[PDB]
Amino acid sequence: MIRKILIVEDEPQIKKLLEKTFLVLGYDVEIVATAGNATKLLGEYQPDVVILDLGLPDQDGQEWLKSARSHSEIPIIVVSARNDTEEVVKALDNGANDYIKKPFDMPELIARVKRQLNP
Amino acid sequence: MIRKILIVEDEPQIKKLLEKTFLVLGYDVEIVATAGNATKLLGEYQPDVVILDLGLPDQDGQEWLKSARSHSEIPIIVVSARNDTEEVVKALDNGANDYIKKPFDMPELIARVKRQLNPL
Ligand code: BEF
Ligand code: BEF
Ligand SMILES: [Mg+2]
Ligand SMILES: [Mg+2]
């Protein structure tokens, strides 16, 4: 019933806000600040949806997206300050389920997470 | 970019509702059920606005308001079931930035929080 969410974000304020919001909404939440931790927790946590930052410190979020898609089909919503149309198109084409540009409106993020968690 | 808010409320239902509301609105939110926790988090959390209940268990919210104002200028919106005009005037004069009587419409509360956090 409770849906697990994996957040891959390196910006602390946004980590805090997303964690808090999705906890209050009744979701189990895990957060990581790096792509490697994101892979390890994709394996161990077995999440139901991934929220992915593209400006990650250790790896380009696009390449981690491409890999995770090679190994999984879990819904991934990209949330990145990268607002160039080419970044959005590459992310969707690399298999992403959605793209949200930062800064965003928390209600819209929640609505899209709900859309992905209820196929 | 991220705006912090501190809620000081002791009724669980209202805590839950305000927390949910202002998290879904994209605010960082902290909650306390006592005046002492409110002071500790006023110092540590450094919020951008405080929503303050006056019917607190450990201290009269009015006195906590007076003190917090003695040491700070952060916006404080009072939200209390005390509906007599005398309480509202005492709270405003003791430094409160706004007063909302319970029961209230969450839209009015949100509009006033936005007015305090983005004073144009
Ligand atoms: F750091 Be990513 F661009 F959100
Ligand atoms: F408990 Be508060 F006075 F509404
Ligand atoms: Mg970043
Ligand atoms: Mg009370």
From TrEMBL, chain A:
Q: Could you tell me the keywords of this UniProt record?
A: Metal-binding
Supply the source organism for this entry: Francisella tularensis subsp. novicida (strain ATCC 15482 / CCUG 33449 / U112)
Protein name as it appears in the record: Two-component response regulator
Q: Which GO terms describe its biological process?
A: regulation of DNA-templated transcription
Entry annotated with the keyword Metal-binding: yes
**How is this protein annotated for GO cellular component?**
cytosol; protein-DNA complex
Q: Where does Mg(2+) bind?
A: 10-11, 53, 55
Superkingdom assignment: Bacteria
Taxonomic lineage of the native organism: Bacteria, Pseudomonadati, Pseudomonadota, Gammaproteobacteria, Thiotrichales
A GO MF term: phosphorelay response regulator activity
